[PDB]
Nucleic acid binder design. Structure first.
Lengths: 138, 102, 143, 144, 101, 55, 67, 72
RNA sequence: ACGAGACUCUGGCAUGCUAACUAGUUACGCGACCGGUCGGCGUAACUUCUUAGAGGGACAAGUGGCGUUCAGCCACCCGAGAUUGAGCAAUAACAGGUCUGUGAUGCCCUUAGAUGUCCGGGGCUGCACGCGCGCUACACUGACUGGCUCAGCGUGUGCCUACCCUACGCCGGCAGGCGCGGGUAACCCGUUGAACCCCAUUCGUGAUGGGGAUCGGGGAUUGCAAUUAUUC
């Protein structure tokens, strides 16, 4: 059928349609280290220095990348590429090579599969916020 | 761009700077001494550099050593390998003062 | 890109003697009509820049701006760029002498005193002509 | 051949494009569009001399993205404060004199025009034209 | 056209789910294509009041809450069958509306 | 006169124009969602109306 | 504090002394069996009972227990 | 404290202070800013002028720090 | 036997399920040349982002240590998570507050302006902090490219609501007094109509550009007054 979960984190999402195609090196369709906010631009250069040029000649990952928030939209591209390699290798040859590159990527950094569960908590009685209380007079 | 062995920056900071004792409040009346205590590296780093960062920020507000060049001095006197840091000298002299409790 | 610009021993624009201690090209702290959006209008209508080396420079910009602002109605623009339209003590945007009086020029003491106004006592005694609250907060504004 | 309006980044290729559109010289400047307050949050204004192209950039991006809009609903996207003294903040807007006169100075550029349901919209001939400038500069000096 | 939409609104999800499942079962018994239950974002009605009838005591509040769950099912059939299938003796509390497009 | 006085300079902020639909009282009104009850009567009748305390 | 309330303790003891052979040392299987042969009106309480049942069988595997 | 340092430029004091950057192995923004007692923006301008003549390869521009590298 | 716990709501996780012409796919595609997907319209993938339901999932479950080797405690891989908020909440009591919430009330009593009415009619909000709650970030970090990060909780109209939320065009410079439409709402405001933090107006140090000291204008949201609380 069609198995497609793409990449997402916190709030943002990189829809990663994985199929055969050109599959050039592009982030938001843009060059290697060229992103306008200019903050976390190295995170993708690392793996492609190990395998070689032949390996990305047939992996087209068409990404709809939407979402404001750096720690969301960044750190979701790493999740997306991890899942892209995982699915490609699992479906094509065997899960041992997927085992290997997933091993290096995930044991390399824990925080792809795990997102921050922290979120703004509820405001309560008699206070300006969640924990603070109004000044008590005597 | 250093050209030399790059380890110098990491290994030229603290191995002689690192505070190896502090102390704690005394009795019910009196503050002229302080009972000696020392820790495994974890709490000594906790307490000593908490007070270091706090003092550096409370006093070094409006800093001539301001960011876009605030890598060199602290990355050379942060990790290990020297006795040259200044709030560290304060805490080391008070460390000797506390060490006198034996 | 370096300039042989010399130490500015004397900085006179409006006939007074103050020594700008800090850097140059923004000694307009005493100049009352150049900067921000009106200066940006002048810049877009003038097409000039300062691509030379900073640190030490010259300040013809403010002179030119105020000189053209002597008669700022040439374009027939209803002028909301100026300091005091509709104003008392000068019909048009004319020129008057002596500085050190801008606060007085924003609080015209003659007409308010002569109209016998309680808002006049707000203006004159140092009270709040708009009415900020004074007892603990609003201790800046009349002190 | 062929490039897409949302494939690659924008700053430098629009730098070349707006440089060409400012060096054209056929744009006789409207004389009541610069004195504009616009917004309070800005302590200054753009001096690129493609400033009319800057409010045009707002219109272009925020009408390509979500159609049927003017230049007031184009910013929901910088939330937080507008600390404006005594009254609280507000939500972005657009000066309509600026829009009138960019419309009067935008005939023949084939960029944008009044749509049939309020606001602005990309002209079909102009849409082909802008895709064509993108592709031509891609083949010539920017994306080859 | 046969474009008929049924809008169901209720304050509880058990009865609403029962009625939607019954409607889907009735439509699917007959050779009748029905677009599945579209779940609306269940607007929540909150009202926060002071607990005390007087103004004395610590400031304590009641946060009353009403949840309104709403579903849409769209299908294509003659109105005789929709009149047949609406008559299922819907349990009380489930507002049902039938509209034509 | 009745027609020479009524709706001449409008009561665009009438506060005595509303009262609790249960006890005819003018204070503590809850006009949200068209309840038009004072807060005490609303706390009395909330369970019957359909508002429940979940949190 | 992870102290088990007497409700889960009594329920686990009854389960294990009535269904000793079905249960084992695996939490998943004990949970499933507790689903099968008891009515626990809460999923959290069922999980707590299953966990204490696993603990109790670990106790019993090395000797008798008084309860 | 008005800084009245060697800033004045005459026929003899001009060509004696603006030639310290390109003539030392150890050149860093820290030394020129907090130790050389003259504005570091002059050093930035000197580095940019050296860049203009093809000595280095510019990468990006900033208001405090200058990014260049060479590959020859 | 109550209370605690359980429980209810609420987050935090599902490359699983249930499927959505209102927000999100489309290569039997036109709005493209010197073989990189191109926004009123283009929506026979049972959906990943969104919505919400049926379930799953966490149990001190695994391991090590301490402990009667009991109840338990500590640490560590594995994990979305190794106690997220709250709500409910015993017995016995205060002469606690409420008769100004109530045709909820016992007793006893005022004016002939029944607090029956009279958009009749200067009752404040002043400034010895006599007191209490508040309106309250300290320079590269303090601030400007409608600048490519960014919201989410919710509200919204013809039964006494003819006092709803507003898009778009009025162009003195944009909220706006005039028109013309949408929305009883996942449908329109709205991808939330003069936005944060950030950005060479810039300070290589700091009483300056860097942050507002009474306090005047350009057009006034349009309110029986506003000043004796509306208004950029």
């Amino acid at each position: 059928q069609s198995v497609q979960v793409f990449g997402r984190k916190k709030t943002a999402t990189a829809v990663a349609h994985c199929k055969r195609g050109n599959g050039l090196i592009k982030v938001n369709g843009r060059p290697l280290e060229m992103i306008e906010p200019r903050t976390l631009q190295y995170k993708l250069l690392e793996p492609v220095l190990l395998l070689g040029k032949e390996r990305f000649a047939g992996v087209d990952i068409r990404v709809r990348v939407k979402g404001g928030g750096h720690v969301a939209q960044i750190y979701a591209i790493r999740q997306s590429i991890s899942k892209a390699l995982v699915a490609y290798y699992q479906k094509y040859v065997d899960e041992a090579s997927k085992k290997e590159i997933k091993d290096i990527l995930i044991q390399y950094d824990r925080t792809l599969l795990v997102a921050d569960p922290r979120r703004c908590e509820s405001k309560k009685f008699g206070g300006p916020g969640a924990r603070a209380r109004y000044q008590k007079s005597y | 761009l250093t050209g030399e062995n790059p380890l110098q920056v990491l290994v030229n900071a603290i191995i002689n700077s690192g505070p190896r004792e502090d102390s704690t409040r005394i009795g019910r009346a009196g503050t002229v001494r302080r009972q000696a205590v020392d820790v495994s590296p974890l709490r000594r780093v906790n307490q000593a550099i908490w007070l270091l960062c706090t003092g550096a920020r409370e006093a070094a507000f409006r800093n001539i050593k301001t960011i876009a060049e605030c890598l060199a001095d602290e990355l050379i006197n942060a990790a290990k390998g020297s006795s040259n840091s200044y709030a560290i000298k304060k805490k080391d002299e008070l460390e000797r003062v506390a060490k006198s409790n034996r | 890109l370096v300039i042989p610009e010399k130490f500015q021993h004397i900085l006179r624009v409006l006939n007074t003697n103050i020594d700008g201690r800090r850097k140059i090209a923004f000694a307009i702290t005493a100049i009352k009509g150049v900067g921000r959006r009106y200066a940006h209008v002048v810049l877009r209508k003038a097409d000039i820049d300062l691509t030379k080396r900073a640190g030490e420079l010259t300040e013809d910009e403010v002179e030119r701006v105020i000189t053209i602002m002597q008669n700022p109605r040439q374009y027939k623009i209803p002028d909301w760029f100026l300091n005091r339209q509709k104003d008392v003590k000068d019909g048009k945007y004319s020129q008057v002498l002596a500085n050190g009086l801008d606060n007085k020029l924003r609080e015209d003491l003659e007409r308010l005193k002569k109209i016998r106004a309680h808002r006049g006592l707000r203006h004159f005694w140092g009270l709040r002509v708009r009415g900020q609250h004074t007892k603990t907060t609003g201790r800046r504004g009349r002190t | 051949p062929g490039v897409t309006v949302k494939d690659v980044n924008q700053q430098e290729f629009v730098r070349a494009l707006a440089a060409f559109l400012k060096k054209s010289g056929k744009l006789k400047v409207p004389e009541w569009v610069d004195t504009v307050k616009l917004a309070k949050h800005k302590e200054l204004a753009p001096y690129d001399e493609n400033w009319f192209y800057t409010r045009a950039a707002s219109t272009a991006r925020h009408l390509y993205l979500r159609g049927g809009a003017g230049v007031g609903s184009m910013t929901k996207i910088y939330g937080g404060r507008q600390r404006n003294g005594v009254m609280p903040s507000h939500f972005s807007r657009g000066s309509k004199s600026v829009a009138r006169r960019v419309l009067q100075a935008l005939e023949g550029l084939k960029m944008v025009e009044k749509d049939q349901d309020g606001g602005r919209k990309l002209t079909p001939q102009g849409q082909r034209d802008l895709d064509r400038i993108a592709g031509q500069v891609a083949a010539a000096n920017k994306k080859h | 056209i046969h474009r008929i939409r049924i809008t169901l609104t209720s304050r509880n999800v058990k009865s609403l789910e029962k009625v939607c499942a019954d409607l889907i079962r009735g439509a699917k018994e007959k050779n009748l294509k029905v677009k599945g239950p579209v779940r609306m974002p269940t607007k929540t009605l909150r009202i926060t009041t002071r607990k005390t009838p007087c103004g004395e005591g610590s400031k304590t509040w009641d946060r009353f809450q009403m949840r309104i769950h709403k579903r849409l099912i769209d299908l294509h059939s003659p109105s005789e069958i929709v009149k047949q299938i609406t008559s299922i003796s819907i349990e009380p509390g489930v507002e049902v509306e039938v509209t034509i497009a | 006169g009745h027609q020479q006085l009524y709706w001449s300079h409008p009561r665009k902020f009438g506060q005595g124009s509303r009262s609790c639909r249960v006890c005819s009282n003018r204070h503590g009104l809850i006009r949200k969602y068209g309840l038009n009850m004072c807060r005490q009567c609303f706390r009395q009748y909330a369970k019957d109306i359909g508002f429940i305390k979940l949190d | 504090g992870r102290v088990r309330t007497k409700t889960v303790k009594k329920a686990a003891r009854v389960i294990i002394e009535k269904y000793y052979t079905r249960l084992g040392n695996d939490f998943h299987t004990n949970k499933r069996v507790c689903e099968e042969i008891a009515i626990i009106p809460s999923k959290k309480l069922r999980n707590k009972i299953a966990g204490y049942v696993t603990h109790l069988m670990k106790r019993i595997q090395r000797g008798p227990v008084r309860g | 404290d008005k800084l009245n340092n060697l800033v004045l430029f005459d026929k003899a004091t001009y060509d004696k202070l603006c030639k310290e950057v390109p003539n030392y192995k150890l050149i860093t923004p820290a030394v020129v800013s907090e130790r050389l007692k003259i504005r570091g923006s002059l050093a930035r301008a000197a580095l940019q002028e050296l860049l203009s003549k093809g000595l280095i390869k510019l990468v990006s521009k900033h208001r405090a720090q200058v990014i260049y590298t060479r590959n020859t």
